[PDB]
């Protein structure tokens, strides 16, 4: 019927409950962040809708995803086939660009092949290839009594054609396509897997499809060029924990007269020329002790540190040895195929007077501006008709969805977690289906507030096109152009999990039992500050970044107070803030072998000791980290076990209830607790260790019971819970405190890093730096943590990032979401527009500054918002 | 929007065609065999609806199939997920059951595991187990004043107490204390001297058996958690039956009476003789019984002195303590590891009941649980009409009934459909690779209606096979019902009913092959049927039909007669079969046609006949024997497993159609012969595929795909091979011909010819010879192999047994291949078929109805005899839909011949 029906959901922390959901019409989950959003909307709806379709595919699909796990629901009547639209399911594995992802590149080689002409690269000449019809029809134009010799003789009329048609296969079928007339060469058929790099019937040689050689740097091999090189200045050479190459280095100077403890960058080119690229021929006498003690004298001819880089890497066959060189190394466009990743034949058949590689190379506005103008003729447009509208369709999506900036030939896994959730939403709008229950997870996430409008439009064409939506979003825009609304359990966790109010957003904004319909109405929002924290003289000066599309950018950002940097997607907010700034002070204070993005130089470094990027990548990689284990929370809870009688007269320690060692663990999982099951065209599933019943120990280790609990239930406890479990203990305490205030409070100290959240996992490792004692000299970085919060979230996480500003220390964060920037002291708004047309400082300083930028559109849309607060505080302050 | 609109499609034989079809309704492809309607609703359809789906669930998803091959197709707008109920995705494979494959079994196990009251097999009680709550309680219910000593197993004394009233305190925490040293068990001697006892785990307090906790997996085959140790959950054994070593209890002992030991063993036997003094010159029948038990089962140790000379002639002595001719069997069967030394002792053993599980397949504590008295495996074992009544007259609790409401529903709503569909007769136990075509599709049908899915394209391949006309209105009520729960439905039918019944309703093109592939008429049934040019329309108006013979074939003195066949659910039955006739054995589904028609008079001839070695089904004799010399049965099983296969193999035309090759110019000078331009020897053939043509993909839940060989583009053959040319045309283009393209291609020579004009008689002619036999219909199979023997030298002695030879064809093709096999009676031989098809069961000249209803209720002659004499049958349900089509049909004639 009309409406999907959800029978009895008790997921996660669902309260067995049951929800109406309108079909066929644009619905929008939202509520604080651990409600049960994504419980009920993924994990019981989806979830359903996927399974009941796959399992029909086969036979053997239902017998296997059959004895797995399924949702805890009662029912669900009205289901369809389901779609999601989330960060999981989009591609991060290399040798894949955003034209492959999107399949704008199997429609652009399947363009090339059907009506791209071929040229010869020696002559430049057009190659084509003609039957024995269309060679007589134009021999026969030509006038009359004009003899001409096949090589018979013939002499041209009007009926000659019975000959000329027979005379011409003779002479084909005696000397036997699209060839060069002045050189023979050639390229016999013109099929679409000839321009695939992922076919090795049409892929580069010298580089396999890939495009990008991998040479050394000089950058990589020396971080500092001012290090003592006592102390190990060059990288690659630094005591493995076995000393060869640091007695080579030694050998090497002592011989041509390098001072050890000397700074690199002031000493002599010569000096640094023959220990980097070596003695060219001259022996050098070198003795070494090897790791047993005893010596070996030799007097090798110096190869020099670079070469030997290169040459280890080459020689090894190893994806280990390989990995411990390329840290030193860096990408370089392929010599043969230019870094457009196909054969030189390949690249020699053009369209519209450029080739496949050069379409590629455009970024979507401009490829989209060429099949605009790309002027064809009748035979050509009548048949590339339908592959051409494909190709303008798609760009067109991506354009809508706010992508235009980036290019076809750009690599897959280097896009954000924004970036490809939307370009699976472009590549989705483009397989037009109808009667699908799409389902997708904060969609404007990395898209700015102007192109909001557009993801609404877009989002209701999918659904006027015959499907329904469920999107789970805490945007305003959006809630309001919603059909229906569903607002989720007040509170979160154990507190959550039920339909607070369902209805039309006018409805669900006029009920008072809804916590988003009051910030909605208007009666509970995020305040101004009064004030503004004045900057002061310390500054940093970043001078002359040009990396990707910045122009020469030369900024300043004020020191101890809260940092906004704004501006459109695909300005250049990340290569500045994160490619540029923060490697570039982290292999400074840090050391770290990151090579920082181009740039001239970075002034105001001596008013910061450390530089912390609070990353929104994932804590563990593996099942074994879990909160508990990077904030250290797990390895001060294990002391207390090991306090209890149990433990004493068993002889426990803090060994046996360890996560990693052999001690107490499970040794069919070896600790895991879960093991991973494969999943073939579906995305990898968890199943509980049916051995530990995902217990995490062995029989003999959790009978060690802590008031009442084991090892086991005290991991399995959530942070609120534990805070108040672990009441007396003033150090685990206060651990636990920072992942309360952090946002969580609602998560278990167990929980896999693994299934974190994007934003989940960035406020994990917020916690940690959280308490600390700071210096007043130390910058955050945060990219986002607005990813996955309610309205009511931020103003709590607002609370703590300026807690650390109050203090002292510095908080740069790289937001879109007008609420967090209206309450940041200081901006630095990025390029008018994106992409090439943007990288360049629109608007700085103070918000109100900002905001009266006619020419920002950050400012644009923060002025109605700052007026629109400013008169609510106003009308609170009379009342 | 509200119909998905499909713009030139051109997958086969499709001439790059548009078409609109509505949404959401019961839309039905028409028209000839080969006309193009699979290439359209599967091939096309179908096939995107799936990949855009799937090229969605992941990354790695979209970038394998993504670079496949996709369907032919320009455009095809207003898609939906699509699902396909056909026999290519039913389950064929041992140890599933028509319960796994249908989901009922698995929520039978977690009605078992919910609900399920275990029971000690010694005692016969329900064991229970109490948590320390419920224990308290209970013994709180007892009068004051009564003394109690909670003590723990000799058995310690935790401590004693007088129950009044504020003691739950110590009471709650002794018990706690006694279940802490005892582990989860606990006395209570009453003072009353009634020592109750109690235990947290489901324990028998009489004699320890326990079960733990009740879980489905302890209930499951597939999973050591329950299935049966002895048999690993496959609850058949097989070993060697007494039957298959000896054919007749009655054969010369001199002449082989022991089939294993058929041309060192026959000099055996002489030696056990000779020791024993068995006569030689022996009708086993009147052998006593210890004189065939010692060569039966062995001399239990006694030494026997056996000397024989080898094949070289060399003699050897040996002094051997002779083990028997059964024992023989099961050892030389068990030792080897060959797929080919077990498959000829195999043809000597039957499977018989794992003595464990009692065939039931799970541990003897999974079967201690019982729900309404019945344990898991004998609710498996009944029918779907048992089962069905079983949980209508189960009683249960207030609390079993609440807590297994979900479960009961669904099961019970399984079952049902089941019904509908017609499977009501065979039982959720039964093996899913003995189920026929129509079977298993059926249940994929059922299974669907389930999955209450909305928004689906489902897809239907003929429905109707193996279903009698009776049963046709519940199959177009469910299809409807599916329809009606906001799903688009394209069923490929050639049934009239279900054509007039659809909502939608196109013809594909008119003829088939090249002939087809375009959209004749497509609307109403009403609309289809006024329109001249749809040769569909003309047989529903009535214009053109099939018209009943003028005389039917009267049978002459030769008869074959099965007597007291009682296999399945046939009851004692005794049958005449008239020979030099066409003969109909009809009857619903579950009748026991198969079991009558394959699985005793089959085999039993074919054993007589041509010494088969099946093993035929339980029957008391069949006479007649000698009125025929051969017993060809035209199964719709497989030509061939493998693409190396493929009409023209199987025909034997291409062994001759390499000769012609091997013999033309350009091979004579190149030396090649009739082996380079073989298709599976190395000589010529494509070494990237090693002949093949097409690679197979490996599709993990998907089903396997074929994709052609990149390096021979499918040809086939490699270049220098196919450069030899005959009329214009290579091997490979000459592979790639059309079975009517061919004949007229192969004009001169007259024994190619020969053979191809079997396949255009047999109804193919649109197909080509190079197909693989792995992508070939049942009923496709079935033809090309009507055709092997279709042209062949007939006595007048030898009996044809085809299976629904309709399967697949339009009513307009059933008229020729009823020509095809009625020509085949002229000669003097006689055709029997299996039929729901009222076109065919009229035509026949005798016809033999099975059992009133199936199941159990049925396996019994409802009525013998000519079609008329059986339309005149009440108790025939066949009779029943027959006769208004005989009188629908002569009248037809009537108006046409006063005309
Ligand atoms: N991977 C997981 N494993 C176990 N429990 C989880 C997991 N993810 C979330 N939960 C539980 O579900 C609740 C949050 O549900 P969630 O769907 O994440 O809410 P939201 O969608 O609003 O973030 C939490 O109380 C948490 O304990
Ligand atoms: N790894 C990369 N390779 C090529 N171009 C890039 C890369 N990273 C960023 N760019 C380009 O730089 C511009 C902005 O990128 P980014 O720094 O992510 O901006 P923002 O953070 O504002 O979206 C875009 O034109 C983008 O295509
Ligand atoms: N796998 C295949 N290989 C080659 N030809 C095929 C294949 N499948 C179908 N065809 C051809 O396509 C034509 C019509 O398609 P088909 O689906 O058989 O029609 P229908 O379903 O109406 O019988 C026939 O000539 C048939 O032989
Ligand atoms: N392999 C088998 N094992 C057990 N029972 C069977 C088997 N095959 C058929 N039956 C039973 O025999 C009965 C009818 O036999 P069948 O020959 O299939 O009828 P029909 O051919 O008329 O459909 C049914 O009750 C069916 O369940
Ligand atoms: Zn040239
Ligand atoms: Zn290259
Ligand atoms: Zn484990
Ligand atoms: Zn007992
Ligand atoms: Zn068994
Ligand atoms: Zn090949």
């Not at 999982?669 to 995902?694: A, N, T």
């Amino acid at each position: 019927m009309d409406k999907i029906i959800v029978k009895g959901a008790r997921a996660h922390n669902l309260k067995n409950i049951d929800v109406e959901i309108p079909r066929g019409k644009l619905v929008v989950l939202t509520g604080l962040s651990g409600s049960g959003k994504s419980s009920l909307a993924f994990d019981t709806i989806y979830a359903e809708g996927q399974r009941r379709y796959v399992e029909s595919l086969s036979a053997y699909a239902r017998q296997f995803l059959g004895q797995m796990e399924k949702p805890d629901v009662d029912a669900i009547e009205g289901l369809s086939p389901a779609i999601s639209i989330d960060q999981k399911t989009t591609s991060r594995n290399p040798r894949s660009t955003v034209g492959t992802v999107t399949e704008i590149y199997d429609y652009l080689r399947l363009l090339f092949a059907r009506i791209g002409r071929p040229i010869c690269p020696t002559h430049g000449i057009e190659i084509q290839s003609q039957t024995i019809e269309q060679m007589v029809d134009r021999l026969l134009s030509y006038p009359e009594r004009t003899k001409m010799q096949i090589l018979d003789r013939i002499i041209i009329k009007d009926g000659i054609a019975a000959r000329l048609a027979d005379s011409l296969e003779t002479a084909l079928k005696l000397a036997d396509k699209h060839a060069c007339p002045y050189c023979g060469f050639s390229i016999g058929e013109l099929e679409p897997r000839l321009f695939s790099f992922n076919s090795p019937f049409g892929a580069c040689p010298d580089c396999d499809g890939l495009g990008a050689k991998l040479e050394v740097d000089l950058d990589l091999v020396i971080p500092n060029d001012e290090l003592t090189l006592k102390e190990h200045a060059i990288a690659p050479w630094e005591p493995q924990s076995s000393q060869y190459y640091p007695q080579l280095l030694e050998a090497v100077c002592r011989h041509y007269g390098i001072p050890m403890d000397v700074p690199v960058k002031d000493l002599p080119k010569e000096q640094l020329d023959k220990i980097l690229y070596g003695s060219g021929g001259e022996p050098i006498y070198f003795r070494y002790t090897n790791d047993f003690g005893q010596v070996r004298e030799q007097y090798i001819a110096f190869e020099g540190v670079i070469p030997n880089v290169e040459r280890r890497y080459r020689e090894t066959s190893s994806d280990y040895i390989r990995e411990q060189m390329e840290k030193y190394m860096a990408e370089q466009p392929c010599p043969t195929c230019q870094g457009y990743r196909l054969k030189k034949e390949s690249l020699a058949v053009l369209v519209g007077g450029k080739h496949i590689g050069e379409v590629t190379a455009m970024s979507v506005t401009e490829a989209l501006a060429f099949f605009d103008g790309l002027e064809l003729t009748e035979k050509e447009a009548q048949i590339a008709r339908l592959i051409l509208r494909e190709i303008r369709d798609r760009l067109g999506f991506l354009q809508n969805v706010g992508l235009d900036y980036l290019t076809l030939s750009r690599s897959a896994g280097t896009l954000s977690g924004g970036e490809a959730q939307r370009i699976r939403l472009a590549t989705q709008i483009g397989s037009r289906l109808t009667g699908v229950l799409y389902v997708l997870d904060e969609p404007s996430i990395g898209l700015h507030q102007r192109d909001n409008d557009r993801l609404i439009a877009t989002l209701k064409s999918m659904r006027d096109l015959g499907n329904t939506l469920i999107v789970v979003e805490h945007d305003e825009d959006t809630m309001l152009a919603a059909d229906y609304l569903i607002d989720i359990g007040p509170g979160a966790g154990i507190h959550g999990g039920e339909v607070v109010a369902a209805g039309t957003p006018e409805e669900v904004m006029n009920d008072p039992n809804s916590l988003t319909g009051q910030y909605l109405s208007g009666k509970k929002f995020i305040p101004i500050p009064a004030e503004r924290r004045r900057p002061d003289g310390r500054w940093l000066e970043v001078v002359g970044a040009r990396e990707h599309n910045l122009k020469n950018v030369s900024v300043k950002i004020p020191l101890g107070t809260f940092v906004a940097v704004t501006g459109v997607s695909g300005s250049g907010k990340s290569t500045l803030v994160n490619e540029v700034l923060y490697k570039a002070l982290a292999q400074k204070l840090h050391r770290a072998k990151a090579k920082p993005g181009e740039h001239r130089d970075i002034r105001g470094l001596e008013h910061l000791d450390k530089v912390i990027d609070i990353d929104q990548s994932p804590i563990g990689r593996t099942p074994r980290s879990n909160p508990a284990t990077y904030t250290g929370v797990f390895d001060d809870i294990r002391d207390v076990f090991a306090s209890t009688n149990e433990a004493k007269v068993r002889g426990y320690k803090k060994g046996r209830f360890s996560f990693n060692v052999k001690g107490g663990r499970c040794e069919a999982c070896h600790g895991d607790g879960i093991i991973k099951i494969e999943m073939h065209f579906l995305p990898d599933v968890y199943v509980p260790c049916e051995v530990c019943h995902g217990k995490r120990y062995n029989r003999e280790t959790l009978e060690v019971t802590y008031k009442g609990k084991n090892i086991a239930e005290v991991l399995d406890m959530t942070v609120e819970d534990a805070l108040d479990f672990f009441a007396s203990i003033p150090k685990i305490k206060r651990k636990l405190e920072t992942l309360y205030d952090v946002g969580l409070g609602y998560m278990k100290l167990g929980q896999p890093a693994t299934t974190l959240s994007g934003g989940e996992a960035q406020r994990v490792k917020l916690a940690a730096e959280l308490h600390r004692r700071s210096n007043g000299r130390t910058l955050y970085i945060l990219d986002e943590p607005t990813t996955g919060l309610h309205v009511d979230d931020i103003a709590r996480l607002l609370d703590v990032l300026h807690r650390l500003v109050d203090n002292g220390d510095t908080v740069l964060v790289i937001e879109h979401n007008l609420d967090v920037i209206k309450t940041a002291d200081y901006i630095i708004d990025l390029g008018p527009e994106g992409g090439d047309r943007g990288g360049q400082i629109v608007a700085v300083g103070t918000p109100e500054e900002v905001a009266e930028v006619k020419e920002s559109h950050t400012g644009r849309y923060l002025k109605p918002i700052l007026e629109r607060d400013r008169a609510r505080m106003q009308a609170r302050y009379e009342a």
